[PDB]
Every structure is written in structure tokens, then in C-alpha cells.
């Protein structure tokens, strides 16, 4: 049930070539970044 992010989220939210996506949990989307290998954190900003 995962969704593609809106344009500006897609463009700016996830760092270090991570992938933006949304999960609908309770009527609001929850955005998340699927990190490329070697990264961690909310926007995949940190190196592991």
C-alpha cells in the first residue's frame, strides 16, 4: 500500500539518492526515505 511522494518531497526530502515514499497509517501520509546502501537516519543523511 505504499505511495509515490509528491513532487517537492520527491525533489528535496530524501538525501544521498535515497528513495522517497509514503505510507498511509491514520489518514495522514507518513513519508520515509528508503536509504541507499551505507546510509541511515530520517533523510538518509548519515553514513553507517
Amino acid at each position: 500500500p505504499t505511495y509515490k511522494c509528491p513532487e517537492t518531497f520527491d525533489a528535496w526530502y530524501c538525501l544521498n539518492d535515497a528513495h522517497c515514499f509514503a505510507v498511509k497509517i491514520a489518514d495522514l501520509p507518513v513519508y520515509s526515505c528508503e536509504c541507499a546502501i551505507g546510509f541511515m537516519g530520517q533523510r538518509c543523511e548519515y553514513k553507517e
Partner: protein
């Protein structure tokens, strides 16, 4: 006095709510604009879900523009290690239209929570449990003309929104990032999922 609205995650009264599991968030308080409370569950064992809007009752976990109220005092919870520990989990019972948020630890100061993992709820229940972790606030400086904050605004009622904010970067000194989607420096984005969910982008503005 401000119109602090009391809403219910299901139904419209205390009686309609489930009983809280241990360590479940019992109310969510939204402090983005005019404060409002969304009731999640009824505390067991004679306790009552705290309803004050601040953190000084000792039953509150703050994250971004929200406060999460717990049936028992929060000092009993351990402090999360950044990245590795799950501060809380979310599950939904689709047939009951009920969400449960179980808190395991408190994020350190200057942290933000984020969705990190999922696992099946278990053998007998349907669906996934979503696991949230804690990350330190970004020291990132904004690139020129890039947004500094994103807003997702769900119109729950004509004069009540449920809003999620995502900070992206720190503005240069002498500049401010808009903190509300109606401030100067904000551009409307797109509808997302539903007609009543609208995104906005905020940009660094001089002053």
C-alpha cells in the same frame, strides 16, 4: 480562551474509545496552530488520560508539533539511542478503524522521529507493525532557492487541520524559515492522496 477542540480517533465520545494497552499513547495533542486533542484510548486501572497542553504534567512526549500523552509517567521509559532503538510502533486494526501507538523509549533532546522499519504484526493478526526511530536534528544549510520546510495539511474540518511538518535545512543567518503554511515565503504544492490533503513548501526569507 482558545477553541481547544476534543476529537476522537473513532466515534465521538469517551465510551466509543478502546481501552489503552500498556504504554499506548492515550491522546495526541496538535500544537501547530490552535491546540487540539485527539483521544486515542481510555486509560486502564482507574487512571485518566492527561489532557494538559504542555509537557509539565510528566506524562508527555514531545515530537515536532505534537505532544503524546501517556497513562503513566514518562520518566519510567529509557532514553533511545539514535538510529538503533525504536521510540514507538504503530499498528492499525482496519475493521475497528483504530490505531495503536506503543512507546518503548524517549528520544534524546534535539531529535526527530522517523519511520524506519516494518515487520508482520504476528501469526494471528493481519498486516504490519511500523517502527519509528530517533535521529538528531539536521545541521544542514539551505542551498539557494531550495525549500527549508515542507508542510502536509489535511483539512479535517473547515477550521481544523491536521498537519505534518518536515524541516529540511537551516536558513542562512539573518533569514528565517516559515513555521506555518500561511506565512510569507510559502508556495502551495499539490493535492496528495485526497482532495483535502494539500502540500506546501516554505523558503528562506530575509529577516
Amino acid at each position: 480562551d482558545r477553541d481547544v477542540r476534543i476529537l476522537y480517533q473513532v466515534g465521538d465520545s469517551e465510551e466509543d474509545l478502546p481501552v489503552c494497552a500498556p504504554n499506548a499513547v492515550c491522546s495526541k495533542i496538535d500544537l501547530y496552530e490552535t491546540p487540539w486533542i485527539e483521544r486515542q484510548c481510555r486509560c486502564p486501572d482507574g487512571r485518566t488520560c492527561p489532557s494538559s497542553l504542555g509537557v509539565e504534567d510528566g506524562h508527555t512526549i514531545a515530537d515536532k508539533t505534537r505532544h503524546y500523552k501517556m497513562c503513566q509517567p514518562v520518566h519510567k521509559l529509557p532514553v533511545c539511542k539514535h538510529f538503533r532503538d525504536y521510540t514507538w510502533t504503530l499498528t492499525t486494526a482496519a475493521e475497528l478503524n483504530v490505531t495503536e501507538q506503543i512507546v518503548h523509549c524517549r528520544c534524546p533532546r534535539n531529535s526527530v522521529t522517523y519511520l524506519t522499519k516494518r515487520e508482520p504484526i504476528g501469526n494471528d493478526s493481519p498486516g504490519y507493525r511500523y517502527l519509528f526511530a530517533c535521529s538528531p536534528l539536521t545541521r544542514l544549510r539551505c542551498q539557494r532557492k531550495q525549500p527549508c520546510k515542507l508542510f502536509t495539511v489535511r483539512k479535517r474540518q473547515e477550521f481544523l487541520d491536521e498537519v505534518n511538518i518536515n524541516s529540511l535545512c537551516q536558513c542562512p543567518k539573518g533569514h528565517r524559515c516559515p513555521s506555518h503554511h500561511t506565512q510569507s515565503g510559502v508556495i502551495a504544492g499539490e493535492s496528495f492522496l485526497e482532495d483535502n490533503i494539500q502540500t506546501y513548501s516554505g523558503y528562506c526569507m530575509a529577516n
